[PDB]
């Protein structure tokens, strides 16, 4: 019954959570000591074992799911910020959803999972093409909406104690930078591409 967006919201919410953990591990935002290997998408991934960090990531993506359901999300961006709170690297997930359709949990769900696995695999080897980040980096998640975020400024307030707000220009601005394509996928319920924007000189 036109459950296309709902399934994508769930599938993507779960994928993005795994993707954020892996990114944090491969970009050394936190020590390898807090990560533990897990099995996701039939592939070995590194997941954090710190409750607070885990809850933070969960809450973040929990709030994005409703926006995904209404297909108001243009991009979900995992941003790595330096000590000066300026973007050093950006993992951009650009999302496009086809018109609503009624999906039957069978092969289409497993097909989408197989396509998402390629993204996990690419993120896992990104440290081979990216220069190491300077010490002191932190991270955040940015959500680009198709319409003014002001309209979705209330739809995203899914959780109390976990408010969202409009981002600044600095939190997004990057000179140049170096662009690295990772993977693109197409399917009946989701079209998505992931690429990284890296600061030219990390010093």
């Amino acid at each position: 019954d036109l459950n296309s967006a709902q399934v994508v919201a769930d599938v993507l919410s779960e994928f993005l959570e795994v993707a954020v953990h892996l990114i944090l591990y491969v970009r050394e935002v936190y020590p390898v000591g807090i990560f533990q290997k897990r099995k996701k998408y039939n592939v070995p991934v590194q997941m954090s074992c710190h409750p607070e960090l885990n809850q933070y990531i969960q809450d973040t993506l929990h709030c994005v799911k409703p926006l995904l359901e209404k297909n108001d999300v243009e991009k979900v961006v995992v941003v790595i910020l330096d000590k000066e709170h300026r973007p050093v690297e950006k993992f951009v997930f650009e999302i496009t959803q086809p018109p609503l359709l009624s999906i039957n949990s069978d092969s289409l769900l497993s097909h989408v999972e197989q396509l998402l696995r390629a993204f996990i695999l690419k993120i896992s080897k990104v440290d081979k093409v990216l220069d190491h980040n300077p010490p002191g980096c932190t991270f955040t998640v940015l959500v680009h909406t198709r319409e003014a975020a002001t309209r979705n400024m209330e739809k995203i307030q899914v959780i109390k104690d976990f408010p969202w707000i409009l981002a600044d220009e600095q939190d997004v601005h990057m000179h140049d930078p170096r662009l690295i394509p990772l993977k693109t996928m197409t399917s009946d319920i989701l079209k998505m591409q992931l690429y990284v924007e890296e600061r030219a000189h990390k010093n």
Binding site: H50, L142, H144, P163, I165
Partner: peptide
């Protein structure tokens, strides 16, 4: 305008290291 971000910051590397030790 059309970019949203969480108000709260994730736990710092320092808080993480504090738990590991």
């Amino acid at each position: 305008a059309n970019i949203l971000k969480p108000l709260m910051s994730p736990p710092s590397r320092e808080e993480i290291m504090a738990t590991l030790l």
